C-alpha cells in the first residue's frame, strides 16, 4: 500500500507508506550532534508556551525543546492534532467526510452551470477539480451584497454544538442566512427542500449509498461540506498565480538541506494548483478515501487559527492561540477522558471555522494568507506556500554549534 | 484576559497573559546549547552566595547556576519575592492596596491644590498621573526644615510590627512626626482628625464604605506613603529621560534576547508619561490589586541596595547580608513551610525596603544615587536601561556557552 | 580455531576467531568522542525507518542511531540477518547447504563439458573455482530463447513455501520450466530422472548416502541454483577488476577505520578473472575450510543486499521514505529479539529468502548484470570502484569514519 | 557581623561574613563550562592520592577531581582540616588559645627587654606586633649553642600525648631543655617557678581571667604558645624584605582572573608584615578572638608538613601518600567512621607532625630560603605577593580553561 | 614504608608506597577533559576483545574503553593479573618464592664456578647479580646438544598440574631431561640426590630448615628455573643497551605523562660516554630490583618484570608475510579467565585452575623466546609490534611497567 505524491513541478516525488508529514519529520532528528530542526516563529512561540504550561504532557517536554528546536513528540503530536481538525467523530451512517461533501457540492454546481454529465464514480469527482473550483470561485467573486462566510448562532448552547440541538436533522432558519457561499449555491438550485431536481442527492446516492440523506433534510453534510469547500477555495486562491521555477531569495524550504543523501516556460493561471491536485490531492485521496480536508491541507487550518488573533512592533507571549491544540493533547496523553477529548475536538473545529470566515471575508484573501504564512510560518514564496499547506510547517536545519 | 504593555517609545509592545517578568524570563532558557542569560553583578553575587548557603532550597541549586548564569527557578523566585514586597498579607476589609492608597493621596493632594474635580472612577485616579506626581514632587522639593522619609519608632517591639501594637487603629504620636511627605500632606489639610477629608471622599466613592478615614485607621496612610515614595522615585529617575539615542553603555538588547519573536527629543516628564499610559495603566487594568512592588520591582531592589551604601578603594563583596531577607522568604516558603516565620520574613523585607527608600529620598539628588546603584549593581547605563530595570527587576544579557 | 582471510591483492590479511563482519564492526565504536561509523545511503534510510517503527526491539534503538550513524547492535543484527538468508533451518539429513549444492552443480557441469576427472574431496570442488564458473557463465551467455531466472508458481500457497507442498519430494512440473540456468544444466545431462548422474556421483562420494538425486529430492536443486546465481553475480562483478589504482571515488579506507591495528607504483595490472581468483583462494576457500556448512549469504552478503535492492528498481527526482525494503529484515529482528515465536520467525526467514530470489532474477535478467550491480552498489552503498565492490560483497557494507565534531 | 581584611598593599579589601578561605573558594566553581581552579603541585598530588585511597569519604570523590582540578568538597575540607591544626579540643578552663599564649609570651618578652608598660587589653597585645616579633627574632638569631626547636620525649607513649601523662600539670624536666626559644625566654626571666615577678601571669590574669595558671605551673599553655610563636616568627621572617608593587614574571596569583566582575617607593624592612598584621591579623582576631594560629596562617602549617619530607639527589617523582596521611585520617574519622577517640588521635598526629616540620624550618641555616623553596616547588608561589597570599589562603588557585 | 626506585640512568627516581605500576597508572585519568592514556596495539586489541566478550566483568566495561583508551579498572586488573603469574598460591612451608629459588640457583652456580665464598645473607644473593647472571648465560650459550627450555610431560593430567601428581615430592624422571638450563646446572653438581649441596647450604642459612633439598622436593627447582629464565631474558635484552640519546622512535615520554609532578631540572648529555656491556642491567638491578626486593622480599619474578611475562605470552602466538590485522581473542583467554573467576564467579577452585593455565602459558612462551637463535631480537620485535617500544629506554620501562602509556588528546 505504498503511494507517491509530488507537491510542486520540478521537485522530487515522495514515496510513503501512509503519511508524508508523519514519515518526513522523524528523519530530521537523526543528526543531533550537528543540527536540529526549527519550524518557524509560530512553532517557536508554541514551544516557549508549552514548556511554561503547568498542565502539559511530560513526554512532550524533551530536552530538544530547550535547544533552539521542538522535540519530535511535540511537533508530530501538534501536526496530528491539526490534521484531525475536520475528522468525523460522530458514528453516523448518514455522514459523509467533509472532503466528500465539498466534492459533491462543487461537482453539482459545475453540472448545474455547464452541460457536463453528472459524475459517476468518486474518481470523476476529482477529475478537473481546478476547473470545477475555478468556476465556483469566479461566480462567488461576483456575489454582491451583505453577508460573510459565517454561521449564525442565536444561543451560546447552540454555538457549543457541531450538530443541531435536541437531535434535530436541520439547523435553525437563521443558521445559513448570512453565508455567501451557501446563498450562491441555494440560488443555483442546489440542495432544495421537497419535485425539484437535487443534483447533490443524485451524486451521493450513486457513489456513497442510500444512507446519505438530501443536504436540505440532514444539514450536517451541508455545513461540513461548505467548510471543507472554503479550505479548497483558499488553497486555489493562494496558488492561482503561483510560480516555482524561480529560486527566490526569501525561499525558506531547502529540501537538499533537510534530506541530504535521501534526495537524488512559466506556469499559467491555475497550473500550480493543477499540479498539486493531480500529484498530491488525487493520490492522497486514492490511498485514504475518507481523509478529512484538515489532513490534505493542515497549513490552511493553521493559517485560519492564526487569522482569529489578527499598532507597531509586537512580541506575543500569550498562549490563547495554542489552547485548543494543547487541550486535545492534555486530554489524549494525560487525562484520557473520552468525553472531554470530544469537547476539545469540537472547540478546535469551531475555532477553525471562525478563522476561515476571517480569511474569506478579507477583501483580498490570498494577500492575508500570504502575510500569515510569512510572519508566523516563515514562507516567502509560492514554493513555500504550497509546501506549508501540505506539511503544516516549513522546517529548517540549524547548526547545533555556532 | 490577555493584555498589552509598552515600556519605552519606539520599542515593541508585549502581549502577556498575566505577568511580563514571569512570561519573559523562561524564554531565555530555550537555547541552552548556544547561550544562557546573565542578570548583572548583584545577581551574580546573589547566585554565588545562594550556592554557598548551608540552608537553601535544593530546587533553586540547579546546574545553570554553575554555568556563568542563574537557574530559571532561582531568578523567577527571587523576582517574585521582590514583587511581593508591599503585598498585603493581613486579611482586612479596612485595607486598600498600597498602590490604591498612594493614588488616593496624590489625587486628594491634586484636588486640594488645583480645585480640579474629585476623581469619580478608579480610571480617573490614573488619568494625568505624571501631572499629579509632578505637582506633589515640586512642592516636596520646596519643603524646607529638618526631617527625612522615615517612621519614628520608640521601642524595638514596635519596629518589628507593620501594624500598630495591641491591635490599635492608630500609630503612636511620634510615628509620622519626622516624615517630610506626611508633614507636607498634613499641612495641606489631607487626612484630618474629626474638616473636609478629600481622601475619605475618594475611598468611599470607589473602594466602598469599609475603608476608614486615614487619620482614624493609619495603616492605609503608612502603606500609601511608602508606595507614593516608589512612584516619586520612578518619576524623578525618568524626569529628563531620552531613549531615541543608541547609547554606548546600553546593556539591554531585546534583539539578542528575543530573536525570532521580535526625530524630536522627549520633553520633561514625557518618558514617565509613556510608561504611565502604556505600562502602569494597562497593568492596573489587568491586576487592579497589584502592589507597588509588582509595578516597579527595580525601585525595591535599588532601595534594598541603598541600605548597604567602610573603607575607600578596591573592594570584593563576599557578604550575604544584602540577600538575607529575600533568602529567608525563599527558605520559609520552599523548605520549612512555617506560616509565622514566613510572615516575619515578609515584614523584615518590607521594613528593609522602607529603610532603603528613606536613604534614596534623603540623598541631595535622589535620581543620581539611583542611577549609580542601577549602573554598579545592575549594569544599567542609560534611561532605556533604567526604565526596563524598574519594570523587570533586572537587565538580562545573552552570554555564549562556548567562548 | 583461528583462521586468516584476504579480500584484495596488496591489502592486509585478517585473522579472525569465527566471523570477519562480526569481529570487525565492534572495533568502529571505540573512539566515540572523535568519530562514529556511517554505512551508506541504504543503511541511513534503514536507520531512519527503524527509529520510526512502532514495533521494533528497544535494544536496537541506542543513541548512536541519532548521531549520523547506526548503533552497533542495529548494524550487527542487520548484517547477521542478511548473512543467514540462505541458511538451512529445516533439520533434514537429505539436505546439503546451498553452497555445497551450487559447488556440486558447477563441478558436474565442468566435468560434463571438459571431461576432466570428477572431484574426489570437498577441496577439489573449490579447486579452480574461477575457471569452473567462467565456463558455466560463458555458456549461459550463449543461452538464447525465452525465460528468466525465476521459479514458476501456480498458486499463492505454493509461493509461501520453500519446500514442495504436502510434504512432497518434487516441485510441480512447471516450477523450473522458465529458469534459463536450470534449462542449460538439464540440456547438458545433469540431474536426470531414473542415465549417468554426475551430481549424485559427487554427493555420494563426499556428502554421504543420505543426499538423494537432485531430480528425486528437488530442494537441493532449487537451493543450489540460487546459490550458483550468487557465485555467477560475484564472478561477473569482479571479472575485469583492478585494485592497484587509488580511485578518487574509493569509499573504503582501512587506514581510517583500523588506525593502530593496521601496519601499512609500476605494478602490473590484474588480468581477466584475477581479482575473483584472489578472493576465491584467500577468502572463499579459508572461509569454507573453517565453516564447511556456511550458506552463500554468509560468504557474499553484499550480493544478497544488492538483490533485495534490485526488487525496488515514476521518472525524475525521488525521495524514498518507504520501509518495504526493510520489512523482511525487521520482521526477523522483531521475532528473534522481542517475540521469540518459532513459527513466525520461520515465516519471516522464508519471506527474506523469497525476496532475495526475486531480486537475484532482476539482477540476472538485466542485459548487463554487472552494470546494474555497479549502479546499486554506488547509489545505495557508496561503492565507487572494484576495491569497494569486492569489500562490499564480503562485508555487506562499506563503513566510513565521520568526525563527531565538525 | 561582617568584617573586612586586606593582604598586601595596593590590593582590594575583602568583606566576609566569617572566613575568607571558606567564602572565596566556592566562587571558583561557578563557570564550569569555561574554567576550573587548580591549586598547585601539592594539591594535584593530594588529589591523585585521594582518588586512589581504598578508605576515603565518597562525597570527596566528585567528577571535578578527574578534570585537572580538585572538587570544592575536597579542597574546602582539606583547608578546614589544616586551619584546625592548632585548635584546642580539650574542654579546659585553664587553657588559652595557642595564639593568645604566643601573644602573651612575645608581649612579656618585649616588656622585659624594653621600658614599655605591660599590655592592658587584648588589643594592646596586637599593637606593634611587627616590632614585638622583630625584637624576639633578632635576639633568637644571637642565641648561640646546641639545641633546636623540638620537644624532648623520653618514651613513645609520652610522644603520643599532647598534654602531660597521668593528668599532670607539668611536662618532665627534659621536655623543654633542647628548645632554643624556650631557653632564651627562660633566661630572660619569663615563666618562673614560685617571689619572682611573672610578666606572663600578670597579662593572663588581666585579660583572660583568674582561671589561667602560671605557665611554669600548668605547662600546656607554654608548649602551645611556643609552637604558635614559631608560626608567627616564620611568617615575619618570610615577609621581612618583601616587595609587592613590582609585577613579577613568576607571580602565580591573578585575582583579576579568579574574581572577574567581583573585582613607586619600595617597602622598608618589616613593612609588608606590618600591613598584613594591621589589615589581616588584627581584623581576623577582632572577629574571631579564639582563632588558632593555624586559622590565621594555614600556609605556614602546610609548609611545615612539607618540610618533614625534605633521600636521593636529582629529579624525583613523589607517588607516596604519607604527607597526606594526617589530613586524610581526620577526614575519614569525621566524615566516615565518626569515632570520637580515633578523631582525637588523628588531630594529635596532625599537630605533632606540624611541630616536627616547624623545627625543620627553624633549624635550617636560612629559614625563609627553605620556606621560599617549598612555596615555589609545592605550591607554585614565585614572589612575595604569592607568599603573603599563600600564608593566608593555604593555596594559590589559578584558572585553567576546560577546553584546550 | 615508602621506597625509591630508578629504571634508567639520567631519569627521575620514583618514590612509591608499595607498587610503581599501581600508583602510576591512576594518575593518568586525572585530566579527562584534555587527554586519556593509550597503552599500545596489544592493549588496544585487548580492549576491543574485552568489550565483545559475552562473559566479562561489568565493572571493567567503563566508558573510557570506548574513548580511544582503556579504563583504569581494566588496565590495572590486567597488569595485576600479569604481575601475579608466578606468585605462590600453595600454602606450603617447604616453598620459596620463584625469585628466591632463582637467586639460590644462580648463586650456587657462581660459587661452584668461581672461588667466591657462599652467600651469607639475602643481600649477598643480590650483590653482583649482573656478574652472576652473565657467568650463567655465557656458559648456557656454550651448551651444545639437543633440548630446549621446556618441561617434559607424558600425560595430559600431568600437564594440567603445577605440582607433581598424587601429592608426590618429585616430578617423573623425564620432566627435566630436555631442559638445557637444568642439564647445565645438574652437570655442575647443583641439587644432587643423597655429595655437597650448595643450594641447600644457602636455603638452610637464609630461608630456614623447612626448605628441603631441590632434588628431594622439586617444586622449588621448577619455579626457580622458570624465574631464572625471566632474569636471563631481562639481562640479554638490556646487554648492549644505551639510553642517553633521544631516539626518534622512543614512545615513552614521562614529561607528557607526569606534567607538574616531574621536576626536569638538568637533562643528560646525548654526547656523553656510552654505557658499557651490562651497565644498563646493572643500573636496573641496583636501583630497581634490589629496592623492590628490599621492600617486598616475597615478590614473584612476574611482579619484578611483567613485560617479560607479556612478551612470553605473545611469543606463543608467533605464518604469513605482510600486513595483518589480528581480531582473535585467544591471546587474552588466560588473563580474561582469571578476571572472570575473581570478579564475577568467585569460584576458588576455578580461579586456581585459571592461575595455573596462565603460568603454564607463560612457561610455554619463555621456551619459545629462549629457543629462538637470537632471543633479544625476537623480544625486541614483540615489544615494538605489540607494545610500541622503539628503543632500549622503552624496553627497560616496558619490562618494569608491563606497558608504555602515551597521552592522546581527547579533542583532535
Numbering used by the authors:
A (entry chain J): 126 to 319, 329 to 398, 408 to 453, 459 to 550
B (entry chain H): 126 to 319, 330 to 397, 407 to 453, 457 to 550
C (entry chain E): 126 to 319, 330 to 399, 405 to 453, 458 to 550
D (entry chain D): 126 to 319, 329 to 397, 407 to 453, 457 to 550
E (entry chain A): 126 to 319, 330 to 453, 457 to 550
Question: What's written in the study?
Answer:
By contrast, pORF19KCTD assembled as pentamers in 3 independent crystal forms with either a single pentamer or 2 pentamers per asymmetric unit. The pentamer has an outer diameter of approximately 142 Å, a central cavity of approximately 14 Å that is slightly narrower than the diameter of a double-stranded DNA helix (approximately 20 Å) and lateral interactions that bury an area of approximately 1,049 Å2 (±44.5 Å2) on one protomer and approximately 1,147 Å2 (±53.1 Å2) on the adjacent protomer. An extensive interaction network consisting of hydrophobic interactions, hydrogen bonds, and a salt bridge stabilizes this interface, and its calculated total binding energy amounts to approximately 19.2 kcal/mol (±0.9 kcal/mol). The protomers also interact via an intermolecular β-sheet formed by a surface loop (residues 454 to 467) comprising a short β-strand (residues 462 to 464), which runs parallel to an N-terminal 2-stranded β-sheet of the adjacent protomer. These inter-protomer main chain β-interactions are likely to confer extra stability to the pentamer. Our crystal structure also reveals that each protomer binds 2 acetate ions via 4 intra-protomeric hydrogen bonds (acetate622) and 3 salt bridges (acetate623), respectively. One of these acetate ions (acetate623) connects 2 adjacent protomers via polar interactions with the side chain of Gln458 of the adjacent protomer, thereby further stabilizing the pentameric interactions.
